[PDB]
């Protein structure tokens, strides 16, 4: 007996949404780890910290909107463990930005695969949901991180003593 | 070479704080799961949903304050996987409240063990931190959940058709 | 079957809290008696009256916070008779202040014994409660009464005709 | 040597006023006990709690106005022990309301006896005081408690699971 | 004959409080010296000056609260000479920050010893006072100085010509 | 190599300014000691306390303006120990006022000697500085203390029981 609300919602889509929820919660956790790296006494870049904390909270938002979608369409949320990030020590502001850029591209690829599945299953509601709330958000995020990586590289991060300090106070501040 | 800030901070305390961070993030995840259970089309108790979502966000706050403490004292945050909750289907408003009460008592026991360790290691800063921000918060939470469980039981939840509906709109609304 | 909320709360602590509730209600009654002594036609020191009435209402506050604590921790309030004060006729403003100082020191000693018991029973929540809401309040009260006793003594109370009158209007007014 | 203010004030009236002061303080204590019964984790009817706490504070007001009267007329306040209430466990919202109704009728009977004594002693000031501040207050209180008892009985308290809960939130809230 | 207010206050605690008052006044003097070093014509880092002047005034606050505590508990303040700071010429912004960090750790160690003494003498009021007003303040101060030292080191202070100038205007400004 | 700013500033003036800085810090410490004497439980003259605390803070101001002058003129501040006051127990309000008057006259004599030195060294900037900020301030302070001493003497301090009490509340309040 399916949910009384379910219509045109393929089980494969339901499962792929559960996988995406986990990936968004994972991304939130990565950014939380980065936020607290930058508030270490031996790093102390408070605007890098604030930037990644904000990104962490945005990813939780991305997870919740997918959870809401699952309920709206009559699917059933199935949560899984949230894996720990690949590092606790993120090495530098530049390295954290590079890792965030890679993460965002990986999440983007997942979203594009989800869109292809929704298209294959003739689910225009799901296609529109991804286009409206996810795909452009990802493109903007990737572009912003690319901008930040370029400036940090050009400024001489991480080894040039003034580079991350000045980027912290003038770009992220 | 210890952190330049570290003073009177035992490695066992540092490790126990890392364990507590994981437990608080776990509690956040349990409450997030409960929040979205109550917005299922076949449950649809929107104030139970809002109540647990608020609890979820409070637990993230508890995790972050411990992460901040670790940095302030010169310890190093070590994150671990956040285990999935024990259930996706929380059965009823009463059952969710009972599970939350058990969770809060378990977290409390962990905090009391942490306080005993801090006392044993002569760390009054850590003892005060737990007393100021954690122990009374836990006592208030446990009491509130106890109140809610009692009322739901007396009203005839979960089988009495009006009980969870009326509790949703008059206690949690 | 203990309360569903009870945790780390020793029966000896529960009983000592009941004893403390009675002592706070007793102190409220002593100060109420003093308040109405000072509004006798043959005493007529209206600011001494107001001062002790305020102290009486504060002690009721101290009793209620302990009653709340008992409920929060899952103990059961057990009330006893509130003994009448040792006098109806408090003799003078100076004598009332001296009696209040002795009362406050006695209540303080009780609170210190309660703190020692809570420490012995490894109850940091109860220890913190006493430190946060009781111990400093007592130290401030004892100091204030000491100040008042000194000034009244130096001014020549109770026999110097102007002393209590002027203290009433310039310190307590 | 009587008070310089005393006039037309019989010793029997003075003594009966002292007895009434004790009865009003007793009633305050009964209602304080009831207030904290309703905030137990296994009762948790917060508007019953608030209702009885308010009644407790009103009774203290009734005691103080009699204490003031004693001073105004030149009598001497004589305080006695405040007996503990007959119960700590008040069983149910309905039972507490029934006990409060009985208490109010008993206090009323005492006030009517005091009025009869004042009449016998030709004390119109005391008669007017009781009529102005006590007798109608009692009639209103008894009527209100009667209303509450009737509704709770009709609703099926204490055994009907929704009755006290709904009365708490819709009459007392 | 002890003070009329004194209770549960050991002579060893009284003496240790006098020693702590002197140490706080000493710390105030060190920071005053640093403040005026940075306004020399050949140093001229006005935000380093303002930062240390603020720290100096905070230490006077720490001294006064201990002086107040001594009076509140019935001890007797015993002042001693305030020793001059170890240097008049503080060499650089980085060196001043390093010296301040060492000073704060030394004051912290003193406060931890005072807390251990208060614990040994069963003085929970004094323990709470130190925890409430001193211990967390010290942890925050040490962390802040650690952050500042790290940034100055990374930026290339004191020899890199732009480092202290830019830190002055962007962190301390 | 002198400071790039130094002009018409004799080494003897520089040294005399350092001596004056120490004397102003000493005066601050004397008044701080007096302030806390008057808040003892066995003295308890809160407006004497406030009066001397204000004087203490003014003396710190006098010290800082001389420190600023030293920097402005290109001299080098040389701090010395701040000697403890001659007493901890200041005996009475009258005695404290007499001691403050003597202190102010001594500081005045020092300032007059500094002015004579500045005149001898043809330093009109330093002469003007002392005249503008110090000499009239001292004359006003000495006059005020003289007024206070006279009133306290006439009122019968320290032995007349009402004198210091009434002066506290009507002159210093
Ligand atoms: Cl479907
Ligand atoms: Cl997994
Ligand atoms: Cl489609
Ligand atoms: Cl350590
Ligand atoms: Cl794991
Ligand atoms: Cl400790
Ligand atoms: Cl227990
Ligand atoms: Cl008894
Ligand atoms: Cl403990
Ligand atoms: Cl009469
Ligand atoms: Cl009796
Ligand atoms: Cl009549
Ligand atoms: Cl003692
Ligand atoms: Cl010394
Ligand atoms: Cl202790
Ligand atoms: Cl020169
Ligand atoms: Cl010296
Ligand atoms: Cl000249
Ligand atoms: Fe973003
Ligand atoms: Fe955002
Ligand atoms: Fe995302
Ligand atoms: Fe793993
Ligand atoms: Fe993202
Ligand atoms: Fe984004
Ligand atoms: Fe909560
Ligand atoms: Fe909240
Ligand atoms: Fe928590
Ligand atoms: Fe698992
Ligand atoms: Fe919790
Ligand atoms: Fe403690
Ligand atoms: Fe909570
Ligand atoms: Fe008070
Ligand atoms: Fe108050
Ligand atoms: Fe009290
Ligand atoms: Fe008795
Ligand atoms: Fe008290
Ligand atoms: Fe505390
Ligand atoms: Fe008090
Ligand atoms: Fe009423
Ligand atoms: Fe009312
Ligand atoms: Fe009444
Ligand atoms: Fe009895
Ligand atoms: Fe009544
Ligand atoms: Fe009549
Ligand atoms: Fe009438
Ligand atoms: Fe009433
Ligand atoms: Fe500071
Ligand atoms: Fe500050
Ligand atoms: Fe300090
Ligand atoms: Fe020396
Ligand atoms: Fe400090
Ligand atoms: Fe600080
Ligand atoms: Fe002045
Ligand atoms: Fe001033
Ligand atoms: Fe001066
Ligand atoms: Fe000396
Ligand atoms: Fe002066
Ligand atoms: Fe002055
Ligand atoms: Mg995955
Ligand atoms: Mg931050
Ligand atoms: Mg764990
Ligand atoms: Mg909702
Ligand atoms: Mg007792
Ligand atoms: Mg009055
Ligand atoms: Mg009776
Ligand atoms: Mg309540
Ligand atoms: Mg020392
Ligand atoms: Mg400046
Ligand atoms: Mg000198
Ligand atoms: Mg004061």
XYZ file of N, CA, C and O in Angstrom, chain E residues 3-5 22 25 29 32-33 36-37 39-42 53 57 60 64-65 67-68 71 74-85 88-89, chain F residues 3-5 22 25 29 32-33 36-37 39-42 53 57 60 64-65 67-68 71 74-85 88-89:
288
model
N 35.508 39.263 62.732
C 34.472 40.104 62.162
C 33.101 39.476 62.428
O 32.972 38.252 62.376
N 32.065 40.298 62.650
C 30.690 39.786 62.924
C 30.121 39.073 61.689
O 29.131 38.376 61.822
N 30.754 39.271 60.542
C 30.247 38.671 59.321
C 30.992 37.378 58.990
O 30.498 36.608 58.178
N 47.570 41.597 45.104
C 48.831 42.171 44.662
C 49.183 41.739 43.238
O 49.651 42.561 42.446
N 47.140 43.705 40.696
C 47.623 45.077 40.575
C 48.945 45.109 39.804
O 49.166 46.028 39.003
N 49.878 46.989 36.185
C 51.032 47.864 35.992
C 51.854 47.445 34.773
O 52.306 48.312 34.014
N 49.995 48.687 31.797
C 50.113 50.139 31.664
C 51.462 50.491 31.026
O 51.554 51.359 30.154
N 52.538 49.818 31.465
C 53.858 50.023 30.908
C 53.843 49.718 29.408
O 54.374 50.482 28.599
N 52.081 52.426 27.177
C 52.822 53.655 26.923
C 54.087 53.381 26.117
O 54.600 54.306 25.496
N 54.568 52.128 26.070
C 55.644 51.804 25.147
C 55.168 52.023 23.706
O 55.913 52.553 22.868
N 53.113 54.021 22.468
C 52.870 55.387 22.028
C 54.157 56.211 21.979
O 54.116 57.425 21.781
N 55.314 55.555 22.123
C 56.591 56.216 21.878
C 56.666 56.651 20.414
O 56.131 55.980 19.519
N 57.367 57.763 20.168
C 57.501 58.275 18.801
C 58.203 57.284 17.877
O 57.966 57.334 16.662
N 59.063 56.423 18.438
C 59.822 55.429 17.690
C 59.173 54.038 17.724
O 59.810 53.035 17.370
N 46.190 49.221 27.163
C 45.604 50.114 28.159
C 44.291 49.513 28.644
O 43.996 49.568 29.845
N 43.263 48.293 32.571
C 42.074 48.695 33.313
C 41.254 47.483 33.747
O 40.702 47.498 34.854
N 42.820 46.064 36.946
C 42.412 46.818 38.128
C 41.032 46.357 38.610
O 40.803 46.239 39.817
N 40.016 44.873 42.250
C 38.950 45.429 43.071
C 37.906 44.382 43.466
O 37.387 44.445 44.578
N 37.593 43.430 42.573
C 36.586 42.447 42.930
C 37.100 41.549 44.056
O 36.310 41.123 44.902
N 39.251 42.604 46.394
C 39.209 43.481 47.557
C 37.792 43.502 48.130
O 37.602 43.397 49.355
N 36.792 43.580 47.243
C 35.399 43.538 47.666
C 35.112 42.197 48.346
O 34.462 42.139 49.390
N 36.324 42.094 51.929
C 35.408 42.788 52.832
C 34.112 42.004 53.049
O 33.593 41.958 54.173
N 34.622 39.310 55.498
C 35.114 39.689 56.822
C 36.624 39.556 57.010
O 37.135 39.644 58.134
N 37.344 39.366 55.900
C 38.793 39.383 55.955
C 39.291 40.821 55.958
O 38.494 41.749 55.802
N 40.606 40.988 56.123
C 41.169 42.323 56.161
C 42.203 42.451 55.052
O 43.160 41.678 54.990
N 41.959 43.417 54.165
C 42.885 43.708 53.078
C 44.232 44.158 53.634
O 44.309 45.040 54.495
N 45.282 43.538 53.096
C 46.653 43.873 53.436
C 47.401 44.121 52.128
O 47.721 43.172 51.405
N 47.640 45.397 51.830
C 48.311 45.747 50.592
C 49.826 45.685 50.742
O 50.385 45.930 51.815
N 50.481 45.399 49.612
C 51.941 45.359 49.552
C 52.412 46.208 48.374
O 51.640 46.575 47.490
N 53.717 46.487 48.317
C 54.251 47.226 47.179
C 53.857 46.562 45.862
O 53.817 45.332 45.780
N 53.589 47.382 44.840
C 53.359 46.860 43.494
C 54.691 46.928 42.756
O 55.182 48.025 42.489
N 55.306 45.766 42.484
C 56.625 45.753 41.855
C 56.560 46.335 40.444
O 55.591 46.126 39.701
N 57.646 47.009 40.040
C 57.713 47.531 38.685
C 57.766 46.364 37.701
O 58.239 45.269 38.025
N 57.290 46.556 36.453
C 57.431 45.525 35.419
C 58.895 45.182 35.134
O 59.802 45.948 35.455
N 60.970 48.355 30.692
C 60.271 49.549 30.218
C 60.146 49.524 28.690
O 59.165 50.009 28.122
N 61.183 48.986 28.035
C 61.279 48.841 26.589
C 60.846 47.415 26.255
O 61.544 46.455 26.578
N 65.862 61.175 20.787
C 64.622 60.995 20.055
C 64.524 62.049 18.948
O 64.931 63.192 19.160
N 63.934 61.698 17.796
C 63.793 62.650 16.655
C 62.848 63.802 17.023
O 62.830 64.792 16.314
N 62.101 63.637 18.105
C 61.146 64.662 18.490
C 61.721 65.572 19.576
O 61.173 66.645 19.792
N 55.641 58.306 39.469
C 55.574 57.386 40.593
C 54.743 57.957 41.743
O 53.959 57.227 42.354
N 51.022 57.663 40.988
C 50.562 56.285 41.122
C 50.475 55.895 42.600
O 49.540 55.182 42.992
N 47.157 54.706 44.854
C 47.123 53.507 45.687
C 46.649 53.824 47.106
O 45.866 53.054 47.676
N 42.951 54.194 46.902
C 42.296 52.899 46.728
C 42.197 52.184 48.081
O 41.171 51.587 48.419
N 43.277 52.232 48.876
C 43.292 51.639 50.197
C 42.195 52.267 51.061
O 41.447 51.566 51.745
N 38.539 51.130 50.192
C 38.137 49.803 50.639
C 38.123 49.714 52.161
O 37.454 48.835 52.693
N 38.801 50.631 52.871
C 38.635 50.691 54.315
C 37.178 51.033 54.650
O 36.591 50.457 55.580
N 34.497 50.409 53.179
C 33.477 49.410 52.896
C 33.635 48.166 53.772
O 32.958 47.161 53.559
N 34.504 48.234 54.787
C 34.566 47.185 55.798
C 33.232 47.116 56.541
O 32.559 48.137 56.745
N 32.868 45.906 56.980
C 31.604 45.721 57.701
C 31.555 46.523 59.000
O 30.451 46.862 59.447
N 32.723 46.795 59.598
C 32.841 47.535 60.848
C 33.171 49.018 60.631
O 33.561 49.724 61.573
N 37.389 56.379 46.177
C 37.585 55.599 44.959
C 37.677 56.553 43.776
O 38.505 56.345 42.879
N 40.933 57.127 41.123
C 40.874 57.088 39.667
C 41.382 58.391 39.054
O 42.044 58.344 38.010
N 45.212 58.244 38.942
C 45.690 57.470 37.800
C 45.694 58.329 36.532
O 46.626 58.244 35.726
N 48.831 59.198 34.105
C 48.824 58.954 32.670
C 49.140 60.212 31.859
O 49.799 60.108 30.827
N 48.676 61.389 32.307
C 48.950 62.585 31.531
C 50.447 62.900 31.555
O 50.977 63.401 30.561
N 52.805 60.536 31.796
C 53.369 59.508 30.932
C 53.235 59.937 29.472
O 54.191 59.820 28.685
N 52.067 60.488 29.118
C 51.846 60.998 27.772
C 52.829 62.138 27.490
O 53.428 62.210 26.417
N 56.281 60.887 26.575
C 56.346 60.440 25.186
C 56.303 61.612 24.203
O 57.017 61.601 23.190
N 59.609 63.200 23.937
C 60.731 62.352 23.536
C 61.568 61.804 24.691
O 62.656 61.252 24.482
N 61.046 61.937 25.914
C 61.689 61.313 27.056
C 61.308 59.841 27.119
O 60.467 59.388 26.339
N 61.921 59.114 28.057
C 61.637 57.698 28.180
C 61.117 57.421 29.583
O 61.783 57.723 30.573
N 59.900 56.879 29.633
C 59.284 56.498 30.898
C 60.112 55.417 31.586
O 60.479 54.406 30.980
N 60.368 55.658 32.871
C 61.078 54.719 33.722
C 60.228 54.501 34.971
O 60.165 55.375 35.842
N 59.561 53.349 35.024
C 58.693 53.056 36.150
C 59.472 52.452 37.312
O 60.474 51.755 37.132
N 58.946 52.701 38.517
C 59.524 52.150 39.742
C 58.416 51.486 40.556
O 57.226 51.688 40.318
N 58.799 50.718 41.578
C 57.795 50.114 42.448
C 56.837 51.171 42.991
O 57.259 52.290 43.292
N 55.559 50.799 43.129
C 54.587 51.670 43.787
C 54.517 51.236 45.247
O 54.053 50.131 45.530
N 55.029 52.071 46.164
C 55.075 51.688 47.574
C 53.665 51.534 48.141
O 52.745 52.291 47.803
N 53.513 50.589 49.079
C 52.228 50.420 49.738
C 51.932 51.657 50.583
O 52.843 52.352 51.050
N 50.644 51.978 50.820
C 50.288 53.071 51.732
C 50.808 52.838 53.152
O 51.132 51.715 53.535
N 46.768 50.235 56.470
C 45.602 49.582 55.876
C 44.321 50.015 56.601
O 43.253 50.125 55.997
N 44.444 50.217 57.919
C 43.371 50.645 58.806
C 43.506 52.158 58.970
O 44.454 52.641 59.589
